[PDB]
Design an enzyme around this catalytic site. Structure first.
Site, PDB file in Angstrom:
ATOM      1  N   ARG A  54       0.801  -1.083  -0.029  1.00 35.94           N
ATOM      2  CA  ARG A  54      -0.044   0.080   0.070  1.00 35.94           C
ATOM      3  C   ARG A  54       0.950   1.339  -0.097  1.00 35.94           C
ATOM      4  O   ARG A  54       1.603   1.448   0.913  1.00 35.94           O
ATOM      5  CB  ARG A  54      -1.056   0.100   1.215  1.00 35.94           C
ATOM      6  N   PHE A  59       1.724  10.733   1.956  1.00 37.51           N
ATOM      7  CA  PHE A  59       1.341  10.301   3.135  1.00 37.51           C
ATOM      8  C   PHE A  59       2.310   9.278   3.587  1.00 37.51           C
ATOM      9  O   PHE A  59       3.148   9.657   4.363  1.00 37.51           O
ATOM     10  CB  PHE A  59      -0.149   9.795   2.941  1.00 37.51           C
ATOM     11  N   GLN A  62       3.829   1.732   2.822  1.00 35.25           N
ATOM     12  CA  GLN A  62       3.627   0.409   3.836  1.00 35.25           C
ATOM     13  C   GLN A  62       3.920  -0.535   3.215  1.00 35.25           C
ATOM     14  O   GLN A  62       3.866  -1.158   2.195  1.00 35.25           O
ATOM     15  CB  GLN A  62       2.235   0.750   4.185  1.00 35.25           C
ATOM     16  N   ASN A 101      -0.852  -0.887  12.239  1.00 33.99           N
ATOM     17  CA  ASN A 101      -1.631  -1.952  13.149  1.00 33.99           C
ATOM     18  C   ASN A 101      -2.898  -1.922  12.846  1.00 33.99           C
ATOM     19  O   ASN A 101      -3.259  -1.372  11.744  1.00 33.99           O
ATOM     20  CB  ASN A 101      -0.983  -1.396  14.714  1.00 33.99           C
ATOM     21  N   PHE A 112       5.561   1.384   8.242  1.00 36.39           N
ATOM     22  CA  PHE A 112       5.432   2.225   7.080  1.00 36.39           C
ATOM     23  C   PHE A 112       6.409   3.531   7.141  1.00 36.39           C
ATOM     24  O   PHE A 112       7.149   3.603   8.176  1.00 36.39           O
ATOM     25  CB  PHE A 112       3.997   2.892   6.965  1.00 36.39           C
ATOM     26  N   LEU A 121      -1.154  10.691  13.761  1.00 35.86           N
ATOM     27  CA  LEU A 121      -0.806   9.201  14.056  1.00 35.86           C
ATOM     28  C   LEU A 121      -0.053   9.376  15.359  1.00 35.86           C
ATOM     29  O   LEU A 121       0.159   8.113  15.853  1.00 35.86           O
ATOM     30  CB  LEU A 121      -0.258   8.526  13.079  1.00 35.86           C
ATOM     31  N   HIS A 125       0.263   5.009  16.534  1.00 33.23           N
ATOM     32  CA  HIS A 125       1.226   3.922  15.990  1.00 33.23           C
ATOM     33  C   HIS A 125       2.776   4.492  16.610  1.00 33.23           C
ATOM     34  O   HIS A 125       3.284   5.447  17.013  1.00 33.23           O
ATOM     35  CB  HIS A 125       1.414   4.335  14.579  1.00 33.23           C
TER      36      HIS A 125
HETATM   37  C1  LIG Z   1      -5.492   4.052   4.300  1.00 32.11           C
HETATM   38  S1  LIG Z   1      -4.023   3.683   5.246  1.00 32.11           S
HETATM   39  C2  LIG Z   1      -4.119   4.664   6.777  1.00 32.11           C
HETATM   40  C3  LIG Z   1      -5.464   5.391   7.114  1.00 32.11           C
HETATM   41  C4  LIG Z   1      -5.365   5.792   8.504  1.00 32.11           C
HETATM   42  C5  LIG Z   1      -4.463   5.633   9.439  1.00 32.11           C
HETATM   43  C6  LIG Z   1      -3.505   4.552   9.061  1.00 32.11           C
HETATM   44  C7  LIG Z   1      -3.255   4.132   7.682  1.00 32.11           C
HETATM   45  C8  LIG Z   1      -2.452   3.243   7.278  1.00 32.11           C
HETATM   46  C9  LIG Z   1      -1.058   3.874   6.986  1.00 32.11           C
HETATM   47  C10 LIG Z   1      -0.435   4.549   8.267  1.00 32.11           C
HETATM   48  C11 LIG Z   1      -0.772   2.911   8.809  1.00 32.11           C
HETATM   49  N1  LIG Z   1      -1.960   2.265   8.603  1.00 32.11           N
HETATM   50  C12 LIG Z   1      -2.430   1.398   9.139  1.00 32.11           C
HETATM   51  O1  LIG Z   1      -1.816   0.796  10.295  1.00 32.11           O
HETATM   52  C13 LIG Z   1      -3.779   0.925   8.604  1.00 32.11           C
HETATM   53  N2  LIG Z   1      -4.080  -0.338   9.029  1.00 32.11           N
HETATM   54  C14 LIG Z   1      -3.432  -1.469   8.543  1.00 32.11           C
HETATM   55  O2  LIG Z   1      -3.092  -1.513   7.448  1.00 32.11           O
HETATM   56  N3  LIG Z   1      -3.844  -2.899   9.161  1.00 32.11           N
HETATM   57  C15 LIG Z   1      -3.769  -3.856   8.330  1.00 32.11           C
HETATM   58  C16 LIG Z   1      -2.887  -4.625   9.553  1.00 32.11           C
HETATM   59  C17 LIG Z   1      -1.894  -3.911  10.115  1.00 32.11           C
HETATM   60  C18 LIG Z   1      -1.101  -4.648  10.862  1.00 32.11           C
HETATM   61  C19 LIG Z   1      -1.225  -5.873  11.489  1.00 32.11           C
HETATM   62  N4  LIG Z   1      -0.613  -6.577  12.287  1.00 32.11           N
HETATM   63  C20 LIG Z   1      -2.383  -6.779  10.903  1.00 32.11           C
HETATM   64  C21 LIG Z   1      -3.274  -6.092   9.833  1.00 32.11           C
END
Ligand SMILES: CSc1ccccc1[C@H]1CCCN1C(=O)CNC(=O)NCc1ccc(N)cc1
Length: 164
Positions: A54, A59, A62, A101, A112, A121, A125
């Site tokens: 992703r 931004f 990831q 997460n 990321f 964040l 995070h």
């Molecule tokens: C649209 S991506 C996003 C949107 C708002 C806040 C955070 C994010 C993305 C990039 C910043 C990190 N992030 C997340 O952590 C979004 N969550 C996931 O991708 N979760 C899937 C996942 C992650 C870790 C684990 N251990 C299992 C599943």
């Protein structure tokens, strides 16, 4: 001192270059140790050959899902998940390295690298490092992203390890 680790990145088989990261083991030793070991692959699994799945321009980029390759998977060296260690480091600007997460206390292997200050964040995070060298490589990865996160090229971590 703090470990230095590297990721060598390809896009569609064409080498983009190397990203070098400092892991702040002085502040978050458990979180830094997880990333370090996954970089060396010394536990029998790790980041080598996994992808950036992703990527969202202006931004973050990831990666780290080496089990399912789609953002649902990955595991830590400790178990499937481990707690948020602390929130002492902040998302201060581009180059910050942070754990992805699925809510509080669900850290696995996904991470990321921010390309802007993502201060919203902070407290959600765990930040555990930053880019020492290779922000140009990061900006290239970023350029292959889209609003939805889907990449327009396959971005592979072809090698990784520890420098010191
Ligand atoms: C649209 S991506 C996003 C949107 C708002 C806040 C955070 C994010 C993305 C990039 C910043 C990190 N992030 C997340 O952590 C979004 N969550 C996931 O991708 N979760 C899937 C996942 C992650 C870790 C684990 N251990 C299992 C599943």
């Amino acid at each position: 001192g703090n470990p230095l680790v590297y990721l060598d990145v390809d896009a569609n088989g064409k080498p983009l270059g190397r990203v070098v990261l400092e892991l702040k083991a002085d502040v978050v030793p458990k979180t830094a140790e997880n990333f370090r070991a996954l970089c060396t692959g010394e536990k029998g699994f790790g980041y080598k050959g996994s992808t950036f799945h992703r990527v969202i321009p202006s931004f973050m980029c990831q990666a780290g899902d080496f089990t399912n390759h789609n953002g649902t998977g990955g595991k830590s060296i400790y178990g499937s998940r481990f707690p948020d260690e602390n929130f002492t480091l902040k998302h201060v600007g581009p180059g910050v390295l942070s754990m992805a997460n699925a809510g509080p206390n669900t850290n696995g292997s996904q991470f990321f690298i921010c390309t802007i200050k993502t201060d919203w964040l902070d407290g959600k995070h765990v930040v555990f490092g930053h880019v020492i060298e290779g922000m140009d490589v990061v900006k290239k990865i970023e350029s292959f992203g889209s609003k939805s996160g889907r990449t327009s090229k396959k971005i592979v971590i072809t090698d990784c390890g520890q420098l010191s």
